[PDB]
Design a binder for these strands. Structure first.
Ligand code: MG
Ligand code: MG
Ligand code: MG
Ligand code: MG
Ligand code: MG
Ligand code: MG
Ligand code: MG
Ligand code: MG
Ligand code: MG
Ligand code: MG
Ligand code: MG
Ligand code: MG
Ligand code: MG
Ligand code: MG
Ligand code: MG
Ligand code: MG
Ligand code: MG
Ligand code: MG
Ligand code: NA
Ligand code: NA
Lengths: 54, 145, 118, 49, 160, 151, 125
RNA sequence: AACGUGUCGCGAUGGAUGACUUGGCUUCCUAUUUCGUUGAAGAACGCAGUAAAGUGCGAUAAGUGGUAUCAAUUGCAGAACAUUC
RNA sequence: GAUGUGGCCUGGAGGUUAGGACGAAGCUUAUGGCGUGAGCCUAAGAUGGACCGGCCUCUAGUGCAGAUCUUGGUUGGCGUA
RNA sequence: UGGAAAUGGGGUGCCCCCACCCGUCUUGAAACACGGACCAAGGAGUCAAACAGACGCGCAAGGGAGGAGAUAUGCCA
RNA sequence: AAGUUUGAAAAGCACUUUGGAAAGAGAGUGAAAUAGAACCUGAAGUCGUGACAAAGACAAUGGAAGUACCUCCAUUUCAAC
């Protein structure tokens, strides 16, 4: 039965999911902490390089 | 600050003293006169506690938690009888000073400790004679200093 | 250290010959440790070693081969007979022996100078 | 508890005399046939019990 | 995403007296005509293959995690709960145990050892030392060879 | 090494052969008949089977084989003369006799006390059938072990 | 030690509840499985078929888990484990774990004999 | 009684299970990190005292030169600057 | 068909407790005991050779008798055609 | 106090009574309805997203991020 | 398809004996050859063999109650008990 639910519009119709036949179209964020650490290390390195300029 | 009620609610299902083996829930708490896993018998938990233990020889020892120094684990428990040949009722009255609700079980435990000491004497003598009959190709001697 | 068992074991079992030479080291005796202040040393052909572990424990002899492909050293004194009664060397891991006498070439003394802890 | 959003959403909103809110993410959707006299019909605001 | 599916593998149909599963094409090979692609087939694709966009991480309300830390600290102020957790604190002087700040001036592991023995933390450290063993099961093949208990935790005012 | 043991091992002789390359069913029949026989009686029986004056009784591996009057001495109607199994078993009995002689036992007194024939690992050949079918053509070799004891 | 006395053990049923037709298929273990086949004569309770387990077969609360000797089996692994049995030693017996080795077993049996703690699988004498 | 049934002890056939993993899969990072007519990628044929495959190499062919390293390689054979040929 | 179960079971994780060369896992059983049952536990190996049990919580590619199911092996027919 | 007496369990045979083949679709299967030689290992309600209801937890006219920065922090996703 | 995963070392079974050989019987090595070479463990299914139980033809299996015989099982008792 369907019952009383919201009318769904989830918009997942396009080949977004990678599988045996599809490359997929996805973006995960698993590298988020490593990229945060890299950005901070890079800022520290650039501050070291351009000392004493702000 | 934190009552025995709350601590019992916290540790009842899960505790290093709860021994749930087969379907039986026993306790290996040193201050439990029974081995039963109940709030009454949890000597490690209760504010005041007393446990009957055996001592060297035929002596019977009573360990008492008086609740005055529960924040100091080294001072928390005090040895108070360590006497040999005491009446089981005397141990029972020593225990009842802190916990009257533990009187019967501690009396029975005093009697059981006495029985165990005499039985151990008999078994040890028999084993000693049996040993005296045997050659015993090896014997270990602990180093002394 | 090496967070991976897989990689550590691969680097050990696929090691090159000079790395295997380093991996196949044996402790020095108390006297040699005192003389050189070096704890252990890679085993070399014509070293004198006494066995400390295994069935040949206590046996003293001279090193005749550091095989390095079988991870064993061959000692002239430790051996056994085949079915036909001839003799065959028995390989021992160098970590089970102790060097009592070093073969000293000039470069060996140089190595010992490099490893002097004082 | 009678002012709760779940209470406000209970029951079919398209039956006569019902004033429950529908489960809809888009407020502007669902404002047509079934809710206006000029769009086919309008659900009746009142029905005698 | 390609594992188990790297084959041509068409179904033979119902004409022949075999099951309708897709079968590997070609000849001259032990896998010619074998079942393919199916979760029940050898060399086939697993049912519902695992993905990397599974929800690995959790967000927890900031107040709830502060509440949890606070409750844990209050629990550590209770000697009965501490021994119930499994620590050996039957010799320590006081709980909560507070020591002088001068242990931050130690330089050798030997002095820290002497200090642990002095305030009777050495019993719990010894419980941990004796608990060391090889992990049971597959975890030892992974980079998790040894297990041990937790032991005492020494809180410093800073990173020095 | 053997599924059973002689009652007295100093008065016994053993022999076995592995992956014999005789037919397992025929060898089963040929070896089983000598199980409780004196060694000389067994050797005479095998010599007479080679001469086709006596037969090997075929019990349990006799589906649709011929009937013969020589099977009556065994209480059967079906028997055969499997020369290949017979010569292999004669060789095995010669080996047992040699083992007995080495041990200083009299072969004229030895009684066969144990005979076991088992199916060994099969060797594969193929055969070609109508409509381009390839269908198996297997060989069924056997293991045989026996020992005999002085009466 | 003597166990505390209980009433007669009844044991309503001593036959096991075995899986339907497991005697006919070597791979089927006798472990019970509730038959769900629509025509199953066991599920439909035909008179001559195997019985199915249910709540009315449950043992008397008073004699449940009591072994024939009259003790209740408590698993123990150590010498120290005997001390929680020392007080209720007319109710619980100790079962030494199968993996406990022979040396530690010697120690356990000596201590248990001293304590008068019954062991289900100790030394015969 | 003969086939044939059952149960148990012991054997065979057969390679499951368990422990073991120099493999796979997945995630993250670091860089003076991106081939070729100065002939690449890929194909082919050869090369060892003994050498099918594989690996490595190219008529200088299981390798030449150099810098480190220091006593082997190893199935056998063969060789025998060590303060580094 | 719905729901419950300090209900059973399996591979891993955080904890806590144990066990193992005086023999772990696996495997064998006219091998008993316990449980209504899923199963648990002991005994014996004249088995094995090195790991692993319990309890609380977390987690998943977590439980088979059948799908003309997949792969490997075996098998009566058959000493037959 | 033993080549043991008991009781219980286990095993095999026998007796008298009972007793149609499992799984499935179907109003109806023991069916002359279909799938069914044996065993091993493998084998099927998953993950993600939107919404709702129940139940747990925190805070409450307010709740909560996210992204990202900061520094403990240069071991520590 | 296919782990070479024997064993800590190859110590990889000299030598005797019979056989054309393959191998067998002995003897050795080894802690262990049911560790003997694509050799750790070695399941199920199927098969051989020995001992036993019996058994008409009720296909076999199955239920429930006994009984005969067995039982490398458990538990209890063994005297003022
Ligand atoms: Mg879209
Ligand atoms: Mg494709
Ligand atoms: Mg695969
Ligand atoms: Mg014919
Ligand atoms: Mg043809
Ligand atoms: Mg053709
Ligand atoms: Mg029962
Ligand atoms: Mg019906
Ligand atoms: Mg070549
Ligand atoms: Mg249902
Ligand atoms: Mg998994
Ligand atoms: Mg699955
Ligand atoms: Mg089913
Ligand atoms: Mg139909
Ligand atoms: Mg119909
Ligand atoms: Mg039906
Ligand atoms: Mg009909
Ligand atoms: Mg149909
Ligand atoms: Na299966
Ligand atoms: Na020996």
């Amino acid at each position: 039965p369907k019952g009383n639910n919201a009318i769904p519009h989830v918009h997942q119709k396009k080949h977004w999911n990678p599988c045996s036949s599809q490359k997929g179209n996805v973006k995960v964020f698993l590298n988020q902490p490593a990229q945060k650490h890299r950005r901070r290390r890079l800022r520290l390195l650039k501050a070291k390089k351009v000392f004493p300029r702000p | 600050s934190h009552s025995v009620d709350l601590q019992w609610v916290l540790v009842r299902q899960n505790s290093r003293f709860l021994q749930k083996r087969g379907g039986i829930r026993m306790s290996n708490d040193p201050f439990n006169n029974n081995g039963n896993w109940t709030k009454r018998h949890c000597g490690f938990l209760n504010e005041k506690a007393a446990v009957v233990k055996p001592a060297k020889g035929g002596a019977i020892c009573v360990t008492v938690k008086d609740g005055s120094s529960n924040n100091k684990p080294r001072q928390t428990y005090k040895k108070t009888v360590h006497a040999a040949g005491v009446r089981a009722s005397d141990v029972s009255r020593a225990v009842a000073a802190v916990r009257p609700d533990l009187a019967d079980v501690s009396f029975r435990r005093a009697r059981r400790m006495a029985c165990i000491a005499s039985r151990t004497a008999k078994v040890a003598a028999a084993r000693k004679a049996r040993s005296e009959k045997i050659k015993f190709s090896r014997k270990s001697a602990r180093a002394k200093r | 250290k090496c967070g991976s068992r897989r990689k550590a074991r691969r680097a050990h079992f696929q090691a090159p010959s000079h790395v295997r030479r380093v991996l196949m080291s044996a402790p020095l005796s108390k006297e040699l440790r005192a003389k050189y202040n070096v704890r252990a040393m890679p085993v070399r052909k014509d070293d004198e070693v006494i066995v400390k572990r295994g069935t040949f424990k206590g046996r003293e002899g001279k090193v005749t081969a550091c095989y390095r492909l079988k991870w064993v050293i061959l000692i002239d004194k430790v051996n056994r007979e085949k079915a036909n009664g001839s003799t065959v060397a028995v390989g021992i891991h160098p970590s089970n022996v102790e060097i009592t006498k070093l073969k000293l070439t000039h470069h060996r003394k140089s190595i010992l100078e490099r490893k002097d802890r004082s | 508890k009678s002012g709760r959003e779940s209470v406000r959403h209970f029951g079919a909103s398209g039956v006569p005399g019902s004033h429950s809110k529908p489960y809809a993410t888009n407020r502007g959707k669902e404002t047509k046939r079934g809710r206006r006299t000029g769009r086919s019909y309008k659900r009746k605001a009142f029905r005698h019990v | 995403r390609l594992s188990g599916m790297n084959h041509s593998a068409h179904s033979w149909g119902t004409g022949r007296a075999v099951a309708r599963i897709p079968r590997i094409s070609g000849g001259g090979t032990s896998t010619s005509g074998a079942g393919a692609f199916g979760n029940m087939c050898r060399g086939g694709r697993m049912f519902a293959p695992t993905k990397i966009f599974r929800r690995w991480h959790r967000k927890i309300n900031l107040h709830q995690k502060r509440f949890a830390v606070v409750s844990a600290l209050a629990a550590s102020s209770v000697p009965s709960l501490v021994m119930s957790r499994g620590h050996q604190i039957g010799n320590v002087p006081e709980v909560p145990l507070v020591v002088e700040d001068s242990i931050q001036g130690y330089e050798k592991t030997k002095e820290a050892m002497a200090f642990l023995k002095a305030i009777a933390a050495i019993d719990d450290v010894n419980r941990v030392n004796d608990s060391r063993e090889i992990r049971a099961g597959r975890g030892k093949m992974r980079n998790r060879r040894y297990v041990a208990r937790r032991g005492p935790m020494l809180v410093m005012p800073n990173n020095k | 090494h053997y599924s059973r043991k002689p009652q007295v091992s100093s008065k016994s002789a053993k022999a076995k052969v592995s992956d014999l390359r005789c037919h397992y069913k025929n060898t089963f029949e040929t070896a089983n008949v000598i199980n409780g026989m004196p060694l000389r009686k067994a050797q005479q029986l095998y010599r007479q089977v080679l001469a086709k004056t006596r037969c090997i009784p075929f019990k349990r591996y006799n589906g649709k084989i011929g009937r013969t009057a020589q099977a009556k001495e065994w209480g059967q109607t079906k028997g055969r003369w499997p020369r290949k199994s017979v010569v292999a078993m004669m060789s095995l009995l010669k080996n047992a006799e040699a083992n007995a002689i080495e041990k200083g036992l009299d072969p004229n007194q030895m009684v066969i006390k144990h005979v076991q024939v088992d199916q060994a690992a099969r060797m594969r050949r193929r055969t070609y059938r109508a409509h381009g079918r390839i269908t198996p053509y297997m060989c069924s070799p056997c293991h045989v072990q026996l020992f005999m004891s002085e009466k | 030690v003597k166990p505390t006395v209980s009433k007669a053990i009844v044991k309503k049923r001593t036959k096991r509840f075995t899986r339907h037709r497991y005697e006919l298929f070597p791979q089927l273990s006798s472990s019970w499985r509730k038959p769900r086949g629509e025509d199953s004569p066991v599920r439909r309770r035909y008179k001559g078929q195997k019985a199915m387990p249910n709540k009315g077969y449950g043992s008397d609360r008073a004699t449940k888990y009591i072994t024939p000797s009259g003790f209740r089996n408590f698993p123990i692994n150590n010498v120290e484990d005997l001390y929680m049995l020392v007080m209720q030693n007319r109710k619980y017996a100790g079962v030494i774990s199968h993996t406990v080795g022979a040396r530690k077993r010697k120690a356990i049996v000596r201590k248990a004999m001293e304590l008068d703690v019954r062991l289900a699988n100790g030394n015969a004498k």
